[PDB]
Design a protein around this ligand. Structure first.
Ligand code: MG
Ligand code: MG
Ligand code: MG
Ligand code: MG
Ligand code: MG
Ligand code: MG
Lengths: 185, 58, 131, 141, 125
RNA sequence: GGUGACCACGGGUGACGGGGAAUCAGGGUUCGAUUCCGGAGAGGGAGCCUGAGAAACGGCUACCACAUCCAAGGAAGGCAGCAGGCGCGCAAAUUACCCACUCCCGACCCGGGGAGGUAGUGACGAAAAAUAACAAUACAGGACUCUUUCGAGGCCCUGUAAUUGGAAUGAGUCCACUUUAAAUCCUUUAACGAGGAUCCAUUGGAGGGCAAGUCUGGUGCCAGCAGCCGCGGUAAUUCCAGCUCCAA
C-alpha cells in the first residue's frame, strides 16, 4: 500500500554509564582539539569503530582458509586503507584491533583542511566548510563530518564561487565598496 | 478537614520578587563546547586551591 | 551563452520509437539552472535538426551549482513525435490542447448519467440542466 | 540436585515454568488480576474529575501535610487520591476539573513519606500544570 | 599567548593536554593565601589586616549608591557582617571579595589606587 | 470402538499465524494489530442466484439490532475502503490534486482505477546539520611568573571585550529557472539580507549514588523537596528565589 523504504538505523550509541569523571574529560579532550559540535559525533565515530572492530573480531574467530574470511579480509582492509586510517603496507587484520578512534577524525574533512593549512584554526576550518567555500575534486561540499578517501586527499581546494578561489567578493565586500563609492568621488 | 491547606504556596508568596537582570547571551553549539574546553584543559595558573573550580573561589 | 556548454552521453538510437535516447549535461558555472528553451535549439544546432521536435526534461543540478543533468528526446518529425509521446510535455510547449473539467465533476457527472437509464436524450441531458 | 539427562527437557521446562510463577514481577505481569485491580488498567495516564481537595499527613521522620485531591476516573469511574506536586498548584486548581493523573513513578507504590498515594496530578484542564507554576501560560479565565 | 600560536603550529604532531585544578567544581570564595607557603612558613605570625582608608571608600560608595550594609551584601552574595568587618577595619581582606565590592561600588578599592572615580572606566571604557 | 499423566478433555488468552522487531558475551527474554505471504470478516447470524471462480455483501433474500424519507399508501440501508464527522479513550492527519509514474481492469494505443502517486497535517522515529570565525587590538586586575620594584611570558580572571574591523555567510524576503500531470520542496541563481551579528537554545540538576555551590536572601518539621537514602523548627550544601557551575 506504500512505496517507501522505512530502512533506517541509529548511527550512534549512548554510553552505558553517564556521569563518569574519566569518560567526560577524555571525550571533552576529543571535541575540544577536533572542533566537534557535540559528543554525539564522538559517539558516532566510536560506534562505527565498534562495528568494524566487531566484524574484524568475527573474521578472526573464523578459521583461516575459509573463503569468506579471506574475501571479507581484503574487503575490510582494502577499504580501510582507501579511507586512509590504515597504512597500505599493513595487510594484517588484527592491526584494526589496535587501531584507535582519534585517527578516524583525522580523516574528517574538517581536520584535513586544517592540516593542509587551507583553513587555519580548526574551528575556523569547520565553519568555512559550512560556508561552502571548500570544494572537493569537482564539487562543492559543506559537511564537517565528510571523510576523505586517500584518492581525493590532494584535491581539496577553495571553490570558484567562493571569494577565495574565483572572484565574486562576498556581500560585506560589496556593501563596503558601494558605501565607499557613495561617500567619495 | 483541618482547613490547614490554606497555607498552600506560602513560601512562594513570601519570597521577595527579584528579577533576572540583563546578562550577555552565552555561546551555543560548538562555540559553547569551545570556551569551557579552553577554560578547563589548557590552563596553568601558579596558585593553590585544593583542586578548586574553573570559577575558582577557594 | 558565453560560458555554457552541452554534453551528451548514454546515447542510443531506436527506430522502434523513431528517435535517439540520450542524456544531457550542462556546465553553467556562474549561472542559474538554464531554462529548457535555450537548451532546445542548443542541442538542435549541433545536431542539425529542427529545434521544434525537441523534448527535454528532468533537469536537476548537482550540489554547489554548475553541472546539471537531465533527459533529452530528439525526434525525426512532429508527426511521429505526436503519435508516440506522452501528452503532458506537448502541453508544456503547447501543441496538444488540454483543458477539461476536474476529475470531481467528471465523477459527479458520471454518477449522474448512471442514475438516468436508457434515454439518450436525458443521458446527454444530465449535463444540460445538471451542470 | 537437579536432573541432567539429555531426554529430560519435559521435566526442565515444566519445572522452570512452574517455579516461574513464584516471583512478584512475573506473577503480577501474567496473572491478570493485578491488571483488573490497577485503576489505570494498563494505562500510563488517566483523565479524571476532581471531587475533594485533601491533605494527608507525612510519615514519622517527616512532619507535614501533603495536599492531594480525590478524583473520579472517566472510564471505570472508581475514585483514587493523587498528590499534586508543586508549592502553589492547589490554588491553581479548584473543585470539579479535568486532570490528567499519572503514576507516581515506582509502578503503583507509595512514594517517600506520603502514605498510600500512588498517583501524581498533571495537566489540569487542558492547560498543563507545569505551565501554570512557571507562568508560561495562564488559566483559561 | 606565545605558545598558543605555537601549539596551532604543531598541527602535525606533539602537543599535550594536561587538564587542570579547574574543570567543573564551584567553591565561591577565593582563599587568597597560598596555604602552601602558609604550611611551610614558620616565622611570620601577623596578617596585614585591612586599612581603614579603604573602609571609608566603601562608606562613600554605598552612601553615594543609597545602599545600607544589608543591601550591598545581597549584591555581593556574602554575609552582611563581612561588609561591617570591611568597613570597621579588621576584615582580613580577600582579593575577590574586595573585587566584588569593587564592582558593586562605583569606586575602586581594589589594587594600588585607594579610590577611583569610576571602576575600570565608565561603562568599562 | 477412538483419545489420555509423553497432559487427553475442559477453561483462559489483553492469541489472527509466519517472514520478522526490540534487547545483545554465549545462552536467552519479550514484541510481532501494522504495508510481504496465508487465513478470516464486511452491524450479528442464516440462505441463495449469476458465474470458471462468491456461500460475494460499493449482489440478492429472511430474522435480530440500529437507522433514513414519507402525502402514513409505501420506499430505501451497511465507510473493519478513500477522505470526513460523532462516540470512546492517555492516545493517532486533509470531506485536497492526478491517472504522469507502478501496475490492474475492458471489446481496448484511445476509457476508467480514493489501487496507487503528489501535496497538506505530522519534535512516531531515523540521517545530516546553523546559533559565529579570523586576526590584531593591545591594555589593565591577580599570590601572577622569571632579576629583589622597574622589563618580559612559562599564566588565570574578567573586562575598551571596542571605532575593533573588515572579510565570510546562511535564516528569512526573494528575479527567473528548475522540478511536476500541474504544482510544492530541494538543488541552481540574481537583488537584499548580521556586531548586543536583540536574527537571544532549551530541558533537568548542583549532599550521596551522580558531574556540578560548606554562595547569598527569604522560610522556620510550615510550605515544600526527595526514584531511594534523606533535607526542612532561625546559622537549609537538598524548599522558594538571585548569581555561578554541571549534564545532554
Ligand atoms: Mg501483532
Ligand atoms: Mg495481506
Ligand atoms: Mg465474502
Ligand atoms: Mg455473506
Ligand atoms: Mg542561534
Ligand atoms: Mg546551584
Amino acid at each position: 500500500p506504500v512505496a517507501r523504504s522505512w530502512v533506517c538505523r541509529k548511527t550512534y550509541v549512548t554510553p552505558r554509564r553517564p556521569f563518569e569523571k574519566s569518560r567526560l574529560d577524555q571525550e571533552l579532550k576529543l571535541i575540544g582539539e577536533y572542533g566537534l559540535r557535540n559528543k554525539r559525533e564522538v559517539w558516532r565515530v566510536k560506534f562505527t569503530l565498534a562495528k568494524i572492530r566487531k566484524a574484524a573480531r568475527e573474521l578472526l574467530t573464523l578459521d583461516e582458509k575459509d573463503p569468506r574470511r579471506l574475501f571479507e579480509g581484503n574487503a575490510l582492509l582494502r577499504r580501510l586503507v582507501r579511507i586512509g586510517v590504515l597504512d597500505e603496507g599493513k595487510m594484517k587484520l588484527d592491526y584494526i584491533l589496535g587501531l584507535k578512534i582519534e585517527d578516524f577524525l583525522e580523516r574528517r574533512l574538517q581536520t584535513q583542511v586544517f592540516k593542509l593549512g587551507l583553513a587555519k584554526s580548526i574551528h575556523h576550518a569547520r565553519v568555512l566548510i559550512r560556508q561552502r567555500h571548500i570544494r572537493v575534486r569537482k564539487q562543492v561540499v559543506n559537511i564537517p563530518s565528510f571523510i576523505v578517501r586517500l584518492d581525493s586527499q590532494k584535491h581539496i581546494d577553495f571553490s570558484l564561487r567562493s571569494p577565495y578561489g574565483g572572484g565574486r567578493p562576498g556581500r560585506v565586500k560589496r556593501k563596503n565598496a558601494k558605501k565607499g563609492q557613495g561617500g567619495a568621488g | 478537614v483541618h482547613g490547614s491547606l490554606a497555607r498552600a504556596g506560602k513560601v512562594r508568596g513570601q519570597t521577595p520578587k527579584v528579577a533576572k537582570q540583563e546578562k550577555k547571551k552565552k555561546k551555543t553549539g560548538r562555540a559553547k563546547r569551545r570556551m569551557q574546553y579552553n577554560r578547563r584543559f589548557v590552563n596553568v595558573v601558579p596558585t593553590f586551591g585544593k583542586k578548586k573550580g574553573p570559577n575558582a573561589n577557594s | 551563452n558565453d560560458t555554457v556548454t552541452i554534453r551528451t552521453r548514454k546515447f542510443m538510437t531506436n527506430r522502434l520509437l523513431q528517435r535517439k535516447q540520450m542524456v544531457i549535461d550542462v556546465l553553467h558555472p556562474g549561472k542559474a539552472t538554464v531554462p529548457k528553451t535555450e537548451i532546445r535549439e542548443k542541442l538542435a544546432k549541433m545536431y542539425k535538426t529542427t529545434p521544434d521536435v525537441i523534448f527535454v526534461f528532468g533537469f536537476r543540478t548537482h550540489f554547489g551549482g554548475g553541472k546539471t543533468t537531465g533527459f533529452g528526446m530528439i525526434y525525426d518529425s512532429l508527426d511521429y513525435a505526436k503519435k508516440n509521446e506522452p501528452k503532458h510535455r506537448l502541453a508544456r510547449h503547447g501543441l496538444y490542447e488540454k483543458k477539461k473539467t476536474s476529475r470531481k465533476q467528471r465523477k459527479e457527472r458520471k454518477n449522474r448519467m448512471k442514475k438516468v437509464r436508457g434515454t439518450a436524450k436525458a443521458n446527454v441531458g444530465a449535463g444540460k440542466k445538471p451542470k | 540436585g537437579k536432573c541432567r539427562g539429555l531426554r529430560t527437557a519435559r521435566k526442565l521446562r515444566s519445572h522452570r515454568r512452574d517455579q516461574k510463577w513464584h516471583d512478584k514481577q512475573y506473577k503480577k505481569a501474567h496473572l491478570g488480576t493485578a491488571l483488573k485491580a490497577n485503576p489505570f488498567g494498563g494505562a500510563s495516564h488517566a483523565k479524571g474529575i476532581v471531587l475533594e481537595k485533601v491533605g494527608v499527613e507525612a510519615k514519622q521522620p517527616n512532619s507535614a501535610i501533603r495536599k492531594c485531591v480525590r478524583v473520579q476516573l472517566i472510564k471505570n469511574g472508581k475514585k483514587i487520591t493523587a498528590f499534586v506536586p508543586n508549592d502553589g498548584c492547589l490554588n491553581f486548581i479548584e473543585e470539579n476539573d479535568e486532570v490528567l493523573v499519572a503514576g507516581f513513578g515506582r509502578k503503583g507504590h507509595a512514594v517517600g513519606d506520603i502514605p498510600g498515594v500512588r498517583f501524581k496530578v498533571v495537566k489540569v484542564a487542558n492547560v498543563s500544570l507545569l505551565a501554570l507554576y512557571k507562568g508560561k501560560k495562564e488559566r483559561p479565565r | 599567548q606565545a605558545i598558543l600560536a605555537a601549539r596551532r603550529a604543531a598541527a602535525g604532531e606533539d602537543v599535550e593536554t594536561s587538564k587542570k585544578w579547574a574543570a567543573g567544581q564551584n567553591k565561591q570564595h577565593s582563599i587568597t593565601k597560598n596555604t602552601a607557603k602558609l604550611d611551610r612558613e614558620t616565622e611570620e605570625l601577623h596578617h596585614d589586616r585591612v586599612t581603614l582608608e579603604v573602609g571609608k571608600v566603601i562608606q562613600q560608595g554605598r552612601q553615594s549608591k543609597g545602599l545600607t550594609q544589608k543591601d550591598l551584601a545581597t549584591k555581593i552574595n556574602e554575609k552582611p557582617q563581612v561588609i561591617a568587618d570591611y568597613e570597621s577595619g579588621r576584615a582580613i581582606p580577600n582579593n575577590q571579595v574586595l573585587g566584588k565590592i569593587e564592582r558593586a561600588i562605583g569606586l575602586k578599592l581594589r589594587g594600588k589606587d585607594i579610590g577611583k572615580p569610576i571602576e575600570k572606566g565608565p561603562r568599562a571604557k
